[PDB]
């Protein structure tokens, strides 16, 4: 008798079980070592999709650029950037004619935005490019970094409010022969110090460091075999960056096709919505097909050429002042440079010798020197490396810089619902790089030459949709956004719960997150009553753990548990204590939406109520705990 | 750190983890009792705030509820409502924008306003329903 | 009103950054603004080369083969074990305890005071090397845990601290030298990747799903109280938790993934405490068996050495010697990797078992230990499927079917699911028997996941849904197959779980195919 | 020999190497082995005459 | 003297052995030359190191 776990799917729809096909249990994949080699797949990557277009030498830079924009059309089946200008606009005319006035409503709402937009709100995001000291620093770090250097520079508008004036700037500063910043100058004194020093670069280099990204290796991320490259750019480009998202977020917004916009429980809805649409509009006696749809390479074939093309046709009846500003961020994205990792590992093993060869000098060390692969990678990159240690990037885009813009030029694809005439009507949904699609024919054959149109079609627009990760059958059964639909039901089983452990801010408040979770999950991702209860016991073990907290009959020795100890025989009434000071945990499914120290209010002791509640006590992000979510707390003397 | 549970794991078992103020009230709590370093001459150690619940000067307790009277509110309704029987048949839920408690897009079979909204989450279900009245 | 002039460098930018076949931005504006497409796709479809198309194919159950035939080939090595911590292989030393917590060299010390016999073995008899474990230094390095634990001091640092140093093979480090050295040197080449081995299945990994699945008489899963139930949905709630604790809370997987978050907690408490020094640290548990009675089971003791770095991806040497009665002679392929030693024997039921000490050099990062602790949402993960399957029950008729389901009652007999098979014939078996499967089967893919597991689960998907379409006469399409499988074996090199999982999936592809035939 | 050129061409008067890292490897003086105490010589199977 | 020096190339590494351990070391490690010393001085050694 051997046990075989996948027998369970004999007796059970692998929809149903499909949760324990995801290992979302075990550590996830995580880099280890240099992400050098993996930006310059990358790059090597996104170029080859792209030699056929035309090579020249920008002038502002002197980078090697490629555009395969508008080149010849492909031949074969491997990926292709060669988008066709006037098949993109050609989509567009036909998505802004299905919604009149969406493009001349979404761009007034974005400038009005605009206006009233302020620099602070830069200071809200990840990780920027800081051009400074050419390093990763928070967005509030750097921001107030090149507000600092440009009044050096006379460039001043940061402190005139608007964004509009900070973002005049940034264009000027892109003009002063020479850029003065504050550097952390490193000086040995044996001890090291970093002090800051006025720098000095010319306008070339500020141009590079302004268009440059820094590239990490996208770490924890989930069901891959092998890493990838995550890009940060710097505030050069982030205001513009913001406007332009803003834009395109607006005209997703009315879209029924998209699905990037929509969070929460309303994705179920949109797969239903889709699913029973298209099933009603079916013909009678035809066949409706569904295409479990997955873009490969969908990052490395967009052009930001195509997205300044897409920002031109939304924003057609505007004022030239805001077309410029809307037209910015995809024009330091076709000049863009890629900042490549941290270097190589060169060792000897006969000398138990070890090196980090920076990126400057890749080229610096005979190509006979590297293994076969970065061999192969370093010869081909040799074209677009600069002597910096940066790559020249033009083609292609980085992975969430133009989220709601990629998904605008995919529900574009999917609004064209016919070539030729022929007898099928496709439609579908689409979320950044993942899309599925609907095709209604008489027959099988006819749905397939849909599905065919469609893949040539897109292939027009710079999306390509992968074969090995593609497959379509009848409607009524497929996936999207990674959830799982079949005859009605939805088994969304793809979101990992978050570790329910306390958020690491403080005693009373970790409570009041925590139990906020749990409930959210239950009306949220449909999460069980039973499961809810358990997810409640972990989170009270870890918080007991973390706090040193137990149970005043617990036998846990500790420092502040004799004290709690100590407070269990002192008081009379246990019931009141909070689990914080070693009273029982009384949160059930009913009552995950109280605080614990109203909820033990009435039981409270008078002594130890006003204890804890102390008006003048010694110890004493509120709304938000750092994404920002609020929970329901109250002040007390474990809010320290 | 980039997890703030672990930083605050490794925070907890450290010796004076906790800021303090100063004032008279900062000054009552002993230097270390039984041991234990509840203080240094600020900073302050979690056993400090464990000695406060337990040993200290019992503040009153007047505006407390009429500072947090929406809490307390929510409480009362808990309290004072009343449980039905659950039934197990498939439910069919309208999305609806509705508000949380006395705004978002959630199923809801039945009474739509707020007070059924915030314990949505012990009433509504896939394959169960449950009947209940706020009090 | 705004004048958002534009520089000269901005400008120069955007007219180079235009697509091909315009001189200037102005030119590419103006002919956005004014000409209009009406056909240009058509015109480009016809254009377009025939090659490029979808190439689609009618999916049959003869089109669907076996994945990773590579796996029945004999001529490969058998793929070994290679999990952080024994799990059924693993023993014990229990010792009775009245329930108080107490640090965990107390504990080691205790347990190992009540088997004073292999606490006292001196004299090492090795029964196999790996391929070049030093035996004397691992020896020595565990007679240093030992002494080490078994001290009056209260300090699990280790008493040496200069053996330790070559015994771990810490002291075998390359030494960083400045870039232009490097440069200069011409025998300094980067070194190629290490190619992960092409193995077979193993039987040893089916033995651990058989065992691991199982129910024993000691229970290690406690959970902490909630508040009182006052609605029917608690009571219910609470009905589904006590039916599902108390079948997998006497499975052996349960205990074993207890043991692997207590480990990896006091792996990361003392990797922020200590950097750059050698710990004992203890492999224990806490149990407690039917009648109630607590025992604190020591497993063995790993050497977490120095550390001297802080992130996510940076190793700490560990190395661990965990007791086990399995001969290591009787698998041989399943132990490449671990020097075993016979440190004695002992009498668990007045019969004699020998005693062997497993040790292996480990390493591990940060960000492993701390998801080693968050090893128990495999609770949450197994039980959610249940809480679906019970659900789903409860729909079809009001009444709930918790009872039912697990027990059976009037009107239904107990639910039961395809487990396993022997001699080519499927079995069934109950609720119980299918949650701890699921159970274990998710603890797997913890202890053994890592990039070759994401890979095939979320690669494999594809082929389990186009499966699930063909069951269903949807008339399932794929573009291309071999490409699809080439994605789903490429990931198939030598992780014990997904090698398994492949002969499981082939295994259960035929079944699937003899139904579809009737 | 560059650096030895540049040194004695140097307008001051001291005769050391300015690098005192480059010499470090061009001479071999790195290139020595470590030396350990005698137990784990005598546990160790490869350390030979 | 001070006994004899052994040293592994593969982890540059060295140590020299006390005269009194001279025998604790298997003689199959020593040079051919020391181990037939080594082999004929056995039956004069003296447990403290010396002949």
Request: charged share 25%; proline share 5%.
């Amino acid at each position: 008798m051997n046990i075989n776990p996948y027998f369970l799917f004999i007796d059970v729809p692998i929809q149903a079980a499909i949760s324990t096909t995801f290992p979302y249990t075990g550590v996830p994949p995580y880099s280890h070592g240099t992400g050098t080699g993996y930006t310059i797949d990358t790059v090597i990557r996104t170029h080859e999709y792209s030699n056929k277009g035309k090579q020249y030498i920008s002038d502002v830079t002197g980078c090697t650029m490629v555009d395969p924009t508008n080149g010849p059309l492909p031949e074969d089946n491997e990926p292709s950037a060669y988008a066709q200008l006037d098949c993109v606009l050609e989509a567009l005319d036909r998505m802004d004619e299905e919604h009149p006035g969406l493009f001349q409503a979404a761009s007034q709402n974005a400038m009005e935005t605009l206006m009233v937009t302020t620099v602070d709100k830069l200071t809200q995001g990840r990780q920027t490019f800081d051009w400074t000291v050419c390093r990763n620093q928070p967005a509030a770090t750097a921001l107030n970094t090149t507000i600092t250097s440009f009044r050096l520079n006379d460039l001043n508008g940061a402190d005139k409010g608007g964004l509009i004036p900070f973002c005049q700037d940034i264009i000027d500063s892109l003009d002063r022969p020479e850029m003065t910043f504050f550097s952390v100058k490193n000086i040995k004194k044996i001890k090291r110090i970093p002090m800051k020093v006025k720098d000095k670069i010319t306008k070339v280099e500020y141009i590079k460091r302004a268009l440059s990204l820094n590239t990490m290796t996208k770490d924890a991320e989930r069901g891959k075999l092998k890493r990838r490259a995550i890009a940060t750019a710097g505030i050069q480009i982030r205001g513009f960056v913001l406007v332009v998202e803003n834009l395109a977020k607006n005209i997703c917004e009315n879209l029924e096709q998209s699905g990037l916009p929509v969070g929460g429980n309303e994705k179920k809805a949109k797969l239903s919505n889709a699913v029973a649409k298209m099933l009603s509009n079916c013909p009678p006696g035809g066949i409706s097909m569904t295409v479990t749809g997955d873009n490969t390479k969908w990052n490395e074939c967009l052009n930001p050429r195509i997205f300044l093309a897409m920002t031109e046709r939304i924003t057609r009846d505007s004022p030239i002042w805001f077309r410029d500003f809307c037209s910015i961020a995809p024009v330091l994205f076709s000049n863009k440079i890629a900042r490549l990792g941290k270097g190589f590992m060169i060792t000897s093993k006969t000398k138990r010798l070890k090196a980090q060869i920076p990126c400057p000098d890749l080229f610096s060390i005979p190509l006979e020197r590297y293994n076969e692969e970065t061999r192969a990678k370093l010869k081909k990159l040799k074209p677009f490396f600069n002597e910096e240690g940066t790559a020249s990037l033009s083609p292609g885009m980085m992975m969430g810089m133009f989220n709601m813009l990629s998904t605008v030029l995919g529900v574009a694809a999917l609004g064209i619902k016919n070539i030729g005439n022929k007898e099928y009507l496709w439609d579908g949904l689409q979320s950044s790089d993942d899309f599925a699609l609907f095709v209604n024919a008489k027959d099988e054959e006819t749905c397939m030459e849909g599905i065919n149109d469609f893949y040539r079609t897109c292939k027009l627009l710079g999306i390509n949709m992968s074969k090995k990760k593609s497959y379509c059958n009848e409607t009524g059964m497929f996936e999207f956004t990674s959830m799982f639909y079949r005859d009605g039901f939805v088994s969304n089983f793809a979101m990992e719960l978050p570790s329910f452990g306390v958020a690491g801010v403080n005693e009373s408040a970790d409570m009041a997150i925590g139990m906020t979770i749990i409930k959210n999950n239950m009306i949220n991702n449909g999460m069980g009553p039973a499961t809810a209860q358990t997810a409640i016991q972990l989170f009270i073990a870890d918080y007991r753990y973390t706090y040193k907290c137990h149970r005043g009959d617990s036998k846990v020795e500790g420092k502040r548990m004799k004290i709690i100890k100590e407070l269990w025989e002192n008081t009379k009434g246990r019931d009141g204590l909070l689990v914080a000071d070693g009273g029982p945990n009384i949160y059930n499914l009913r009552n995950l939406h109280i605080p614990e120290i109203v909820l033990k209010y009435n039981l409270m002791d008078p002594e130890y109520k006003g204890r804890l509640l102390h008006p003048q006590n010694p110890f004493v992000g509120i709304k938000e705990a750092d994404k920002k979510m609020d929970y329901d707390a109250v002040s007390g003397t474990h809010s320290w | 750190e980039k997890n703030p549970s672990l930083r605050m794991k490794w925070a907890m078992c450290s010796n004076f983890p906790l800021a303090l103020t100063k004032g008279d009230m900062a000054n009552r709590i002993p230097l270390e009792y039984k041991g234990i370093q509840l203080k240094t001459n600020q900073m302050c150690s979690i056993a400090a705030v464990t000695w406060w619940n337990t040993y200290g000067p019992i503040g009153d307790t007047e505006g407390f509820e009429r500072v947090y009277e929406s809490f307390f509110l929510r409480k009362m309704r808990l309290d004072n409502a009343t449980w039905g029987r659950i039934t197990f048949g498939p439910v069919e839920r309208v999305r609806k924008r509705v508000l949380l408690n006395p705004r978002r897009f959630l199923p809801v079979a039945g009474a739509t306003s707020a007070e059924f909204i915030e314990m949505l989450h012990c009433l509504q279900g896939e394959n169960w329903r449950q009947i209940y009245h706020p009090g | 009103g705004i004048d958002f002039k534009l520089g000269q460098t901005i400008s120069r930018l955007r007219d180079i950054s235009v697509p091909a076949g315009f001189s200037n931005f102005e030119g590419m504006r103006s002919y956005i603004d004014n000409i209009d497409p009406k056909g240009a796709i058509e015109r480009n479809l016809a254009r377009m080369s025939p090659l490029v198309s979808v190439t689609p194919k009618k999916l049959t159950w003869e089109d669907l083969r076996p994945i990773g035939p590579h796996i029945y080939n004999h001529e490969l090595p058998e793929v070994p074990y290679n999990a952080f911590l024994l799990m059924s292989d693993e023993l014990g030393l229990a010792n009775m305890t009245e329930g108080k917590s107490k640090k965990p060299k107390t504990l080691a010390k205790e347990c190992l005071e009540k088997y004073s016999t292999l606490r006292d073995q001196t004299d090492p008899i090795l029964i196999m090397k790996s391929e070049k474990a030093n035996e004397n230094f691992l020896w020595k390095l565990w007679r240093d845990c030992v002494n080490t634990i078994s001290n009056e001091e209260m300090s699990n640092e280790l008493q040496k601290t200069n053996y330790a140093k070559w015994a771990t093979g810490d002291g075998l480090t390359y030494q960083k030298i400045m870039k232009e050295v490097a440069i200069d040197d011409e025998t300094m080449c980067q070194e190629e990747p290490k190619i992960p081995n092409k193995c077979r299945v193993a039987a040893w990994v089916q033995t651990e799903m058989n065992l691991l699945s199982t129910l024993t008489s000691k229970r290690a899963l406690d959970l902490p109280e909630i508040g009182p139930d006052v609605a029917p949905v608690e009571h219910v709630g609470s009905e589904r938790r006590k039916y599902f604790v108390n079948e997998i809370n006497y499975c052996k997987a349960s205990t074993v993934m207890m043991k692997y978050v207590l480990f990896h907690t006091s792996l990361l408490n003392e990797s922020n405490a200590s950097m750059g020094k050698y710990k004992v640290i203890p492999i224990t548990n806490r149990v407690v068996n039917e009648k109630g009675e607590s025992f604190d089971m020591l497993y063995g003791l790993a050497v977490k050495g120095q550390s001297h770095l802080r992130g996510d991806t940076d190793v700490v040497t560990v190395v661990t010697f965990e007791f086990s009665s399995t001969d290591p002679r009787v698998d041989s392929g399943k132990w490449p990797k671990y020097t075993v030693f016979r440190i004695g024997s002992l009498f668990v039921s007045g019969r004699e078992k020998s005693v062997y000490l497993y040790c292996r050099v480990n390493g591990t990062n940060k960000i492993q230990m701390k998801w080693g602790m968050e090893a128990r949402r495999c609770l949450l993960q197994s039980m959610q499927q249940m809480e679906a399957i019970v659900e789903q029950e409860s729909s079809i008729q009001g009444y709930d079917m918790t009872k039912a389901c697990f027990k059976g009652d009037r009107v239904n007999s107990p639910k039961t699911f395809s487990i396993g098979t022997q001699e080519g014939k499927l079995v069934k078996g109950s609720f119980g028997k299918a949650l701890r499967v699921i159970f274990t089967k998710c603890l797997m893919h913890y202890v053994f996941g890592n990039a070759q597991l994401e890979g095939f689960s979320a690669e494999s998907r594809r082929l389990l849904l186009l499966i699930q379409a063909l069951k269903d006469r949807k008339g399932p399409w794929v573009f291309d197959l071999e490409g699809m499988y080439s994605g789903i074996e490429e990931c198939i090199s030598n992780n014990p779980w997904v090698i398994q999982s492949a002969y499981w999936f082939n295994e259960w592809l035929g079944f699937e195919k003899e139904g579809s035939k009737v």
